[PDB]
Amino acid sequence: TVPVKLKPGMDGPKVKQWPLTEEKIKALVEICTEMEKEGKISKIGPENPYNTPVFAIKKKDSTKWRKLVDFRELNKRTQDFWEVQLGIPHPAGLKKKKSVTVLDVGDAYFSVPLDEDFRKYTAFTIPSINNETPGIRYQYNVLPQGWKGSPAIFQSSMTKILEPFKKQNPDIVIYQYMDDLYVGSDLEIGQHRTKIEELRQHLLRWGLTYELHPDKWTVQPIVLDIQKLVGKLNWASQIYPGIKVRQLCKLLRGTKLTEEAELELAENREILKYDPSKDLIAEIQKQGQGQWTYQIYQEPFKNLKTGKYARTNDVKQLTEAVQKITTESIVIWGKTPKFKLPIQKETWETWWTEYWQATWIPEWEFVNTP
Amino acid sequence: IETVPVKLKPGMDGPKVKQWPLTEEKIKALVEICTEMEKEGKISKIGPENPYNTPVFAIKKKDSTKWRKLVDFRELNKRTQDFWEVQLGIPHPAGLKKKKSVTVLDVGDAYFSVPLDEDFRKYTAFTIPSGIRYQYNVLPQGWKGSPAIFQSSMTKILEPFKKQNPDIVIYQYMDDLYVGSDLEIGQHRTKIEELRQHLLRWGLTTPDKKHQKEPPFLWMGYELHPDKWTVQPIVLPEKDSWTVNDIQKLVGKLNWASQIYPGIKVRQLCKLLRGTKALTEVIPLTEEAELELAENREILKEPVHGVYYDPSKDLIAEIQKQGQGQWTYQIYQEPFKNLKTGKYARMRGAHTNDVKQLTEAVQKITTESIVIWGKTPKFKLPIQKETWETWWTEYWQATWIPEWEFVNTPPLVKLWYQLEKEPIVGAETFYVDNQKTELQAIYLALQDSGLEVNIVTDSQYALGIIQAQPDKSESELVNQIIEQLIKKEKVYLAWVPAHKG
Secondary structure, three states, rough: OOOOOOOOOOOOOEOOOOOOOOHHHHHHHHHHHHHHHOOOOOOOOOOOOOOOEEEEEEOOOOOOEEEOOOHHHHHHHHHHHHHHHHHOOOOOOOOOOOOOEEOOOOOOOOOOOOOOOOOOEEEEOOOOOOOOOOEEEEOOOOOOOOOHHHHHHHHHHHHOOOOOHHHOOOEEEEEOOOOEEEEEOOOOHHHHHHHHHHHHHHHHHOOOEEEEOOOOOOOOOOOOOOHHHHHHHHHHOOOOOOOOOHHHHHOOOOOOOOOHHHHHHHHHHHHOOOOOOOOOEEEEEEOOOEEEEOOOOOOOOOOOEEEEEOOOOHHHHHHHHHHHHHHHHHHHHHOOOOOOOOOOOOHHHHHHOOOOOOOOOOOOOOOOOO | OOOOOOOOOOOOOOOOOOOOOOHHHHHHHHHHHHHHHHHHEEEOOOOOOOOOOOOOOOOOOOOOOOOOOOOOOOOHHOOOOOOOHOOOOOOOOHHHHOEEEEEEEEEEOOOOOOEHHHHHHHHEEEOOOOEEEEEEOOOOOOOOOHHHHHHHHHHHHHHHHHHHOOOEEEEEEEEEEEEOOOOOOHHHHHHHHHHHHHHOOOOOOOOOOOOOOOOOOOOEEEEOOOOOOOOOOOOOOOOEEHHHHHHHHHHHHHHHHHOOOOOOOOOOOHHHHOOOOOOOOOOOOOHHHHHHHHHHHHHHHOOOOOOOOOOOOOOOOEEEEEEEEEEEEEEOOOOOOOOOOOOOOOOOOOOOOOHHHHHHHHHHHHHHHHHHOOOOOOOOOOOOHHHHOOOOOOOOOOOOOOOOOOOOOOOOOOOOOOOOOOOOOOOOOOOOOOOHHHHHHHOOOOOOOOOOOOOOOOOOOOOOHOOOOOOOOOOOOOOOHHHHHOOOOOOOOOOOOOOOO
16 A cells, blocks of 8 residues: 655646547446446545546457546646656667567556555546436546556566566566556567567466567758748758858849859758757647658757658548657657647547547647637 | 535635524524424434534515525535536437437425435534524535535436336436336336335435426426427516525526527626625616626527437538628438527637638537537538648648538638649739738739739738738738639749848
């Protein structure tokens, strides 16, 4: 029974549920009755003033629905406090790895029922279709699954269990995050999925129960009726100070030399050539269908990774982009990014819950007019 | 008498009483009123050792009833644990399918069967002036979290009946228990008798008069006719001398009416009058009060009619641009019915806000749809697909409308500006050169010649607007750009590239 005490003199979660599809209601009802039969969950009445939404998403290329409880206020008040008590360090050599496997563990973090002293804070609500049948609520008396605080407590179990795996192959570097598992392999693909199979076997036998390819891609420097392209040089002049295009300004007072031209060629040779104080902020720009742009920032001047995403409808492409960018951001700097999207708040809210293949929900703040 | 845990908010002082008698006969009337339920099981006699009570201002506000017990709990509502609402909105009848046997039971002494926890028992203490001291032993009306506690108790009582036979549907809200059975009324009699006996086990009261079989079922202004959810005309009477208790009644009725018939100031009238703890006071009406009276005369003038939802078929929504910023969205399933017709986008914009507004409209349907029917409609929006596909790949902030269809309506939100993929440059015309900034060049361009002019110009206090192309407000520049792009090649204005720096 680890004492879980959050920020002094502050409230908890009070986020209201947003109604969704009727099939989602069926799936969530089935999974909540399953949870009640398992005992990890317990109904509460109106005496509990704390709430959290709950969603139901289809599995990756599978029809098995999965219930996902997503919230940010308890992660904002409790988990960041765990970062002092039982914080998790990030790996430095994980970037150099040839391939990194992302695996979802099954109910491992919700296995220890110890935190009942604050359990009145966690609660998720399943409403009716028409606000007609009374809404049914449930309360966690076990370590919250799908919560960033669960890895902190289950860290001792992971450390005690992973040791034989470490002995078999110490070169693999791991950094668990929420309900994930990021193993790093650098030798070759065959031994990589051999070790993956061994990892699933270890997961099954001891009761503990897509792969991104880092370093295959890096930052993309900029490129370059040619009067408008100079404006692009003004857009990113702060990023790279090499360009000097002051020569072209002359003889321009009215619309109607080898040195300055070489300067653009100099831009061409610029094509060839993290601090936990502040968190990450991601911005995505549309720039035509099939080609999005994502930029991860720590400060406005520093661009930790400039990137562009290329691979229907606008919402699905942006959602998949957000997933990929989050899996990229977790590796390199240790914390989930704070997204910004060029999408209407409620338009995005309509269907983003219907399809998302991740157990981790990133903080985002949509841009809105003042 | 199922126990329920309810506690005061931490570190809060209990209620305090400062009460005065109103009339000499009022004292004895209140004594008789309290003694009747005291010898009944509702309340019990307690000693005066508790120094906390709440002021009482019960009055014979209505002559139809001989006497009533009105106790102020607005002070204790400030000092209580803020519970969590069970559900936000009243069920829209569109969710209720057309049923075969519909009966609306109503419970009268529901607040007199649910007990109250020991914590609040000492707090809800009322005294009759010139006084014997009582504490309120059951769930009290006017208590801030009373609806949620009553709903939870009702669900606890009703769950065995829901689980023993789930063929029928039982919907409970607003202290009334609706049951609609697919079986005939004759077999409904046995099932409803079983339900009444079930509620007899737990001591609740279901008056015989409240049982309804006649087609006009009125529960919250929704006449549940066999096939049309006609809203009964809510009379909403007005009296010259508005008592304050009637003022809170009027505010509650205003919000409950605005839930279906939009009312701007329904909550604002309550905000006008605050701190009026005493339940006996005369409140003159304001001019805005009469404005809201006329407003609810106007909106309630049309009683909505609609055929209930049918699971077999799919919704078909449509938005008609009946005005500039006035779009009527009809959601029909079969032809010739307005299931959830409503006025939308009131004062959304001065002028044509491109197709974005339409997009918003679409969304403002679909979410409402998923709240009322648990589905998503296949929209039948008028304008041709070509406009939305030139607006799909070429728009700045990605936005997705669910679907589209082919319908024709004269007033088209199409703005006819820059529809086709414009050429990068043209044979512009040179010249020496706040929506007036571009307006110079725009009017300099000739609509008959076909040649286009594109020279960027800057002006104070509108630099960001110049780089932009806003259409949210009505400008004569919009008229010029509309009349210029038509019967000519595409016009692509140049933007400041900052060669200087």
